[PDB]
Design a protein around this nucleic acid. Sequence first.
RNA 1: AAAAAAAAAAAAAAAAAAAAAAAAAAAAAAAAAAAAAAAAAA
RNA 2: UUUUUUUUUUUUUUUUUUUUUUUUUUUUUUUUUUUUUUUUUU
Length: 1183
Amino acid sequence: LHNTIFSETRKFTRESFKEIEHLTARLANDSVARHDFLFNTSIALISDYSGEDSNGNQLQATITIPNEIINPKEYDPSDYPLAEDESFFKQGHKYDYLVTFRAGSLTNTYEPKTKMYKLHAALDKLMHVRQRKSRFADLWRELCAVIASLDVWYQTTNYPLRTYVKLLFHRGDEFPFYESPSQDRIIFNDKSVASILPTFVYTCCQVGTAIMSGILTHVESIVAMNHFLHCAKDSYIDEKLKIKGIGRSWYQEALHNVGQATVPVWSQFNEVIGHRRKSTSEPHFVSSTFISLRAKRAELLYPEFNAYINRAIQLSKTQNDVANYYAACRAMTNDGTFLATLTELSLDAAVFPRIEQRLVTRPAVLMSNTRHESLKQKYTNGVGSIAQSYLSSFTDEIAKRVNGIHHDEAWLNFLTTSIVMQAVFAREYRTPERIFKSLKAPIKLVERQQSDRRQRAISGLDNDRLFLSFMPYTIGKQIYELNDNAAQGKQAGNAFDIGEMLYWTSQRNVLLSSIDVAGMDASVTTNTKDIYNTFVLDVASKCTVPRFGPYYAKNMEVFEVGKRQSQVRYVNAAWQACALEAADSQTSTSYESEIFGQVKNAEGTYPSGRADTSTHHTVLLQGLVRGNELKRASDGKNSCLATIKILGDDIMEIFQGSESDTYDHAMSNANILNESGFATTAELSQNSIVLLQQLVVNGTFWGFADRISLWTREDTKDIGRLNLAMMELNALIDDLVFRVRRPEGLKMLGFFCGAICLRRFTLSVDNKLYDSTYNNLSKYMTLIKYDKNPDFDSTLMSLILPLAWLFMPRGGEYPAYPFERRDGTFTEDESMFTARGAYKRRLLYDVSNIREMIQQNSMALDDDLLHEYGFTGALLLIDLNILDLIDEVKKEDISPVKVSELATSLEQLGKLGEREKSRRAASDLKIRGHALSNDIVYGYGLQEKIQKSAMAKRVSSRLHDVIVAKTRDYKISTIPADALRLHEFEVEDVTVDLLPHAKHTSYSSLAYNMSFGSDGWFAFALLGGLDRSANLLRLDVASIRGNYHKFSYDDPVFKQGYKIYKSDATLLNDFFTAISAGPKEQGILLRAFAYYSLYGNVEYHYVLSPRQLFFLSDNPVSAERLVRIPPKYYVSTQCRALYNIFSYLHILRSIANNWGKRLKMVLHPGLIAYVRGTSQGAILPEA
RNA sequence: AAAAAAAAAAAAAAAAAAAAAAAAAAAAAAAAAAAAAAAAAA
RNA sequence: UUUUUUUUUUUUUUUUUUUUUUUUUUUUUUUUUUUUUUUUUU
């Protein structure tokens, strides 16, 4: 495989392509040929080696595998101990994850129904099951995808990673272990093999993605694996989590030693204006921690990797150097993984309450109940008054808003989400009997698995426990309207997300402190709530609501501090609720297991997965920091601040002024976060913003490529649906575009992800018909015969896809390689910037040689070519509806990862009246006879993400008749709208004059694709910038619809909108309320109905993922100056911007073959005839 | 006068694809009741 | 034979996967007719 006609050419031809298809067939299907392919006895085992650093400095690394992985210690059950009473694991057990040991040393010698037997059963579950995490298929097919891509890329197997695969995973003539989705277990064959290797499969996969991606060279892979195997001496993850923090904080060393390095000057609006040369030297108070990190990286690290870090300090010249060595040192200490074990194993050191620093003191309680509870309470000092001197100013404004809402509706609506539900609300919620079942309701512990960090405990949803805390959220969320402090904002996905981070990194006199606060769950004690409780109460005293069920506004007896007797004062409903909510607070997350029964936690554990909890932590943090600004302003010291953003786990703070007025204020904010009880590490620098999966230094973007996990699902549940899987893959590759230093490797790697991983598709055919479907399908397709089983109604027969399916318009939508026409002229290689959608239908025409299509003046496709490569078969498999459907509720989850989880937290309980409004809307449509599919309605949604989160293909006669129908002669069907794709571009001899920001981004690259003279940088020089305007438009669409859905006639939204329009036009208002249609959305649809009825279905449709173009322009006006259109086309056609869309999508489509020359436009005459008969705004309903 | 072939246009019955909606079939999941087997105190 | 666990047989309600049947909805298309023109023979 390392050779081929392909791997030495990289094009697709008659020979090369079909060889790739036929060969990946056996690298996928066969469970033998994979054992050869990986484990072949002809490879040179590497002893020493000489590679390069990621920047080209030549290192020399050696492959050393420890014996403890080769000959593991036997199982010594002092690793996981128990308490004497065996109520729960012993405190301070060093191992919260799997310890290495022999696979067959752990067995059950014990009778059922004991605590030991359930230990060995639960750990026996832990290594065999919880170590099974994979996306597409068997983990060995994943190693074959990565490793195959490595071979084809480097045209050899000389490289080290394969020798790790051979030394580690080949101990015998078979695979040491495999995984069966029937049992959902990793079944060991060799019982002398180590226990933790099935994770090192996924680890070798991730490292391989680092090599193909371009981050880690081969030597860097050797140091990576050496580090891993060294951390696997005792416990893999357990000994990583010590390192992962310290292994990366260095670059501030490197950035300190770089001295003067240039940088692009950002602007607030997301332009790039100048480029300045600034000193990167860290100030004194930052340079003092350098000694501590020096001493600390010695005592803890693997020696070779430590020497590689010191090497990354000494030998880094410019800033780009620090970025590269940081992507390396980040890929070495960290993997695409999901850290997981038995929840009760990691429960303590994660969610168990932690108390340190200084305690918190009570506010003096001025107003009380007859129960001696708290009504009004106010602080002596310090921290309470520090927060209240800020937060307590919003109460005046928040009273007006909380009074306006009708809070009986604020609950009813939420019950109807997740009439006759009112009578449910009352029977139930009108009695004070409700708060009994509330107070006595246990709280389930729901853990969520994180990529690079430990299991995160999340507080769960409905009902009653949230029903206690609903009101103080109804008051508490109002501050989001009144502040820039917290960020709940819309996620665009573009660089517009990061724009202001870049802005403040490029300003002068800046001190950037990004605090990692993530311990807010177990670091918030019981008294640390009162900082928020005084706020919510002091708002509720102003708030007047007559009833929030079951609370009546009524005269209640109160005791003040200065008054001995009881007094009569009118007490509202929200004031009573907020009196009990603080007056009764019990947070115990009790995980019920099979081992220990029902475990429990003490209180002061307040995990933030919800609107209540997140809006608690954000209000606390705001009050603390801004109130501290007011405190410094009250002591006369000038308060230095610019912006403060509370992200999900991270606080942003930005300063100006001298080092004393910045610094002293920074230390003051740190000291007041410590006096509130939180022990956090503030990260202070002239230039950096650390956060998570966003690293912003000097106005560049270093963003983390490891946080994306290519090979591992979080749910571990395999899904045999091919379309959905390839959507996962395409979306991840869209996430890694600007996070990967060389994202050509993503295209090969992802390609063999498509070929090797997702290929075979099992389907049962009713036994009266077997060889018939095998005939019709096996003409084009390639199947696997079976023997009809002993009297089953339907017997399984698999289907291995034609490899050409990955490139097809409705099939896999992927950045295709260049094919070969009959002219010997290859097509254009796609650069990762391409349109997934009806635009991919052009390839059928590129293979037909569109230039002759225009020279012959004909409409046609070659089924000779396309049949020879296998496009016709793939289009059978697409047209036969054989594959597995996808909703838009699944596309509601796109799976890019978000900067701030805060949005995902608040939108659980957010927008109740809206989702209820669209609910009653769509239900009214359903009552009137025209219904809507559950994908389209803005109401519902999130429900299978919420309501059904808490709960527990056959070939029939019809399919046979359809197959018989289409499979005699397929003859790929030509939709007349395809005339739009018959344009093609001549290459002129002039040159394009680049935009000014080319030179600004020419020195220190923005992201890892922006390096000088590279696809990202050059395409950026040609187009390269966002529209803040247009992005604000699509955001104005976003939070309303919940997402930005770029319109097209193929969307079921438009379809079921047109059914209504055509049939009953009086329901369009109800329909628009059901889909949450904003004003311009309504306008666009009402234009698309007229255009769609007049002209039929006519559009030129494409999809550019907002993550796919992170810095690049979505607006296709930037291609005007790039191409030229001969005046012939100006004469006849009245249309313009469509041609700018062709030129746009094409220029993004190549940028590799593009050396900077300008292009022309050649239009097929049938294209002109097709355009001049259809209005421009019909093809493009948006503009 | 004739009819037919060929070119193209207009109209017309019918299979199919897909959203929603109804009935049946199958198979699996969760609970219950009636015949029997082993049993721990009597 | 009174107190407790499982299993098999039979029965019910509900749930899900797929199949089949029926309709409205929205498009693709054998076949028939009429019309503008060329061709042929008595």
